[PDB]
């Protein structure tokens, strides 16, 4: 309850409050680890041998008031390190009141974008887990990223008056790009309905021609996959006013009655 | 559920029942093929592990687990919410992924989610569900049961309790004499409104004072802020 305060670089190393072999219950510290202004914090466990889930490690990221949280370590066993983001980490001890453990031990170190690996350059786009992928896996239809951030957001809606309404802008690589109405049909609506996690496509309408960018002619194929060409090349364009429906909402499809009781 | 009645088999599909060592701590909430939402104070120091937790989806009695429609998984991630705090009670959300996909069936159907900035008006009445408790001292329900609770504000909530800090991320639901509200067992399950033939997911339970207590309504996680981070996480 009245453990250490704030450390800076010079110490770096800290135990929890009574390391040899058995902490106080009833315990509640807080070791706001410091740095500069642009370096991050990598905590690193030395040792970590607490209780069961009554005993807790709160591993936070505040830098102001409103704390934000990172891991909550607890267990005997090795736990893995923690990468901050701000100059601040707050760490704090909650304990029960009986069947105390060990202890923990810890010591950090200040650096700049620790944790997040450096981008490969060279036209490498890189997603959430860190690998790159320059266009293997740009919203072709394969799994490269595990974190399924190669798959991300590259078709969204554009001037959308309510929420599932709105345009079929795609994006190749990098521009973002309206489609046409070549030759378009009910399947290939319902399955960009289901690529924008939506459900089925519903009455879609073309308007006029508004936007000068890459338009991109959307086909369809037996194989399964929709091959669109970024072709600039169309005569009277027509935009198409995707209208996509929602999925399998609440909507009790059992046998159930109306009774009130 | 204290003051309510059982609910008839699949009338809530979206209610998945959370084991952790055979035992069922803290009801989920089904809204993708392989996403759950449950609130994050049961999940909190259990997020280490999460092969210790198994969903039984579709669940209707606590004593029929060999049921042709029960679907049991496993949990291979739990992510907390980053922005809670257990002192505070703020941002009790937590989503768990499950280690297969499920089919949907009559009996097992993903629940809805509120678009962003959809006002909930004050007295409007919302189901709740969920393997709870029917006595605060006593022992938990078999039967899944069911109650429906009103809609309070937060300003009302906030003057009935002054112990916790009601923010704007908590939507209080209770009625002014008490009886019906949810108990121990009843935490991160689902706060369901009818709305255009469609129950959405307006609340998780989070906490209360006391449950079966007169003019003592429970507080609820509004799933309406939550929205992005939750659809963040089902693409
Ligand atoms: C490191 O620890 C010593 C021992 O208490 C203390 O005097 C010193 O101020 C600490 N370093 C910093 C930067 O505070
Ligand atoms: C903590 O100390 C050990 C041994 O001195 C060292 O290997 C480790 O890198 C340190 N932790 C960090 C985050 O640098
Ligand atoms: C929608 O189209 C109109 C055309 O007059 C344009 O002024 C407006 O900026 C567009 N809005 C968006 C969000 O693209
Ligand atoms: C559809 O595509 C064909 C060639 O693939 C093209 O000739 C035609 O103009 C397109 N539009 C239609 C058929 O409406
Ligand atoms: C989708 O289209 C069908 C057929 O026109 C219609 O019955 C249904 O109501 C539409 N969906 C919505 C949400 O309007
Ligand atoms: C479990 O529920 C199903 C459907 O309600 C029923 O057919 C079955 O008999 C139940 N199990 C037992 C052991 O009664
Ligand atoms: C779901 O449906 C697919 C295809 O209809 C089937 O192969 C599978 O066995 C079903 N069940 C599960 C749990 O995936
Ligand atoms: C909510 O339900 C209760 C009991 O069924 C009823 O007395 C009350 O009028 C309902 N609220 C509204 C707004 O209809
Ligand atoms: C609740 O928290 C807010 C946060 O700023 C604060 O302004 C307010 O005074 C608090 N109210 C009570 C009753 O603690
Ligand atoms: C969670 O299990 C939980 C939520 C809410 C209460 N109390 C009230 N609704 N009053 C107890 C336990």
């Not at chain 1, 760490?91 to 650096?111: C, E, H, P, S």
């Not at chain 2, 959370?18 to 996403?35: E, F, I, K, T």
Request: charged letters at 20%; aromatic letters at 10%.
């Amino acid at each position: 309850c009245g453990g250490p305060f704030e450390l800076w670089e010079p110490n770096t190393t800290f135990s929890s409050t009574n390391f040899p072999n058995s902490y106080p219950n009833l315990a509640f510290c807080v070791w706001i680890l410091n740095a500069q202004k642009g370096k991050n914090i990598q905590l690193h466990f030395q040792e970590f041998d607490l209780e069961n889930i009554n005993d807790v490690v709160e591993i936070r990221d505040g830098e102001e008031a409103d704390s934000l949280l990172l891991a909550v370590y607890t267990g005997p066993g090795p736990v893995k390190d923690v990468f901050s983001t701000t100059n601040r980490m707050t760490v704090l001890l909650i304990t029960n009141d009986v069947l105390a453990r060990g202890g923990f031990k810890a010591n950090f170190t200040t650096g700049y974008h620790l944790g997040i690996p450096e981008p490969c350059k060279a036209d490498h786009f890189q997603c959430k887990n860190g690998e790159c992928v320059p266009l293997v896996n740009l919203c072709d239809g394969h799994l490269h990223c595990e974190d399924g951030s190669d798959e991300a957001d590259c078709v969204r809606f554009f001037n959308g008056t309510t929420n599932n309404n709105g345009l079929v802008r795609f994006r190749i690589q990098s521009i973002w790009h309206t489609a046409c109405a070549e030759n378009w049909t009910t399947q290939i609506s319902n399955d960009v309905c289901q690529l924008l996690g939506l459900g089925s496509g519903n009455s879609s309408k073309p308007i006029f021609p508004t936007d000068g960018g890459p338009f991109v002619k959307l086909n369809t194929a037996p194989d399964g996959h929709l091959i669109l060409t970024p072709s600039q090349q169309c005569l009277q364009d027509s935009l198409i006013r995707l209208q996509c429906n929602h999925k399998s909402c609440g909507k009790k499809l059992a046998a159930q009655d109306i009774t009130p009781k | 559920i204290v003051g309510g009645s059982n609910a008839k088999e699949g009338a809530w599909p979206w209610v998945v029942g959370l084991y952790y060592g055979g035992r069922l701590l803290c009801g989920a909430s089904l809204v993708s093929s392989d996403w759950l939402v449950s609130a994050a104070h049961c999940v909190y120091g259990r997020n280490l592990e999460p092969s210790k937790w198994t969903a039984i989806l579709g669940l209707h009695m606590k004593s029929n687990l060999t049921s042709p429609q029960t679907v049991p998984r496993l949990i291979d991630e739990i992510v907390i919410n980053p922005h809670y705090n257990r002192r505070r009670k703020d941002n009790d959300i937590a989503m768990m992924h499950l280690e297969f996909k499920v089919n949907y069936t009559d009996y097992i159907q993903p629940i809805c989610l509120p678009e962003e900035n959809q006002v909930f008006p004050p007295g409007r009445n919302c189901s709740i569900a969920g393997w709870g408790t029917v006595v605060y001292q006593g022992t938990t329900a078999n039967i899944l049961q069911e109650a429906d609770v009103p809609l309070l504000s937060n300003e009302r909530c906030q003057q009935q309790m002054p112990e916790y800090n009601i923010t704007e991320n908590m939507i209080c639901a209770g009625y002014e004499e008490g009886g019906i509200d949810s108990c121990q067992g009843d935490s991160g399950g689902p706060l369901m409104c009818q709305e255009n033939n469609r129950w959405f997911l307006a609340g998780v339970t989070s906490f209360g004072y006391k449950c079966a207590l007169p003019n003592r309504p429970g507080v609820y996680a509004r799933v309406s802020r939550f929205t992005e981070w939750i659809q963040s996480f089902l693409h």
